[PDB]
Design a binder for this molecule. Structure first.
Ligand SMILES: [Zn+2]
Length: 258
């Protein structure tokens, strides 16, 4: 009876195994654009992805992760609200069963069709496993997906999904450039939060980009053909793998833009 996104093991149950689910800095949250505080001291984001080395794509039973070589400062995030250098380790998405839901964060209660999370860890902690134990251990860049025109830089991901249909399957996935997933503008909101899946640790500086990317209906439909289950188990489509918004509690969302 592992955690998941079903009626009997979904997010409203996670607190029984992970009591931090009811914590003070849980994610995602609704971004109220009118009460977010413009902070002129926030610096522009510095995304240096030109030397990124993707390795593999994996269906882990809750999403698919594209994993990167994080043994050197190859693909790094700096600047913005961050102190120090954060290395890209993986990206993954959350998506819905319908185009009107799927994102984890919302903007003035608006849901997007999907949300991309680029996960980075603070190099001062030496490895990802140590970083998750620290309040400044991770920085996650969150990008919304809306349905419209196709995103050509996403198609290489979409085309390999047939090879990792079920939980535990992995495939080599080299030479993927994540710059093809970024919007034109890097204006952002930021707040302190958590991982949105168990163990729900409160270790994340969230950086949520204001500008969504557009993907086509055909691209997102291919996400919905993945399976939560392993091969030979009954088929459960991997859809609605998003956590609902959590209370903001004593936190302020800051904006890099007016
Ligand atoms: Zn995520």
């Amino acid at each position: 009876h592992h955690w998941g996104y079903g009626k009997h093991n979904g997010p409203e149950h996670w607190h029984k195994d992970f009591p931090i689910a009811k914590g003070e800095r849980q994610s995602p949250v609704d971004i109220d654009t009118h009460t977010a505080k413009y902070d002129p001291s926030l610096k522009p984001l510095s995304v240096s992805y030109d030397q990124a080395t993707s390795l593999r794509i994996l269906n882990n039973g809750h999403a698919f992760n594209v994993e990167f070589d994080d043994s050197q400062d190859k693909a790094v995030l700096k600047g913005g609200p961050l102190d120090g250098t954060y290395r890209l380790i993986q990206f993954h998405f959350h998506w819905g069963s319908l185009d009107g839901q799927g994102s984890e964060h919302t903007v003035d209660k608006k849901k997007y069709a999907a949300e991309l999370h680029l996960v980075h860890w603070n190099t001062k902690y030496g490895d990802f496993g140590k970083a998750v134990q620290q309040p400044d251990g991770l920085a996650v860049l969150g990008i919304f997906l809306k349905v419209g025109s196709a995103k050509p830089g996403l198609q290489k991901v979409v085309d390999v999904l047939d090879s990792i249909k079920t939980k535990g399957k992995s495939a080599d996935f080299t030479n993927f450039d994540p710059r093809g997933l970024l919007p034109e503008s890097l204006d952002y909101w930021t707040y302190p939060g958590s991982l949105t899946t168990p163990p729900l640790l409160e270790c994340v500086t969230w950086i949520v980009l204001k500008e969504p990317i557009s993907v086509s209906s055909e691209q997102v439909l291919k996400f919905r053909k993945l399976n939560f289950n392993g091969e030979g188990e009954p088929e459960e489509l991997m859809v609605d793998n998003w956590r609902p918004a959590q209370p903001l509690k004593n936190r302020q969302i800051k904006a890099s833009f007016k």
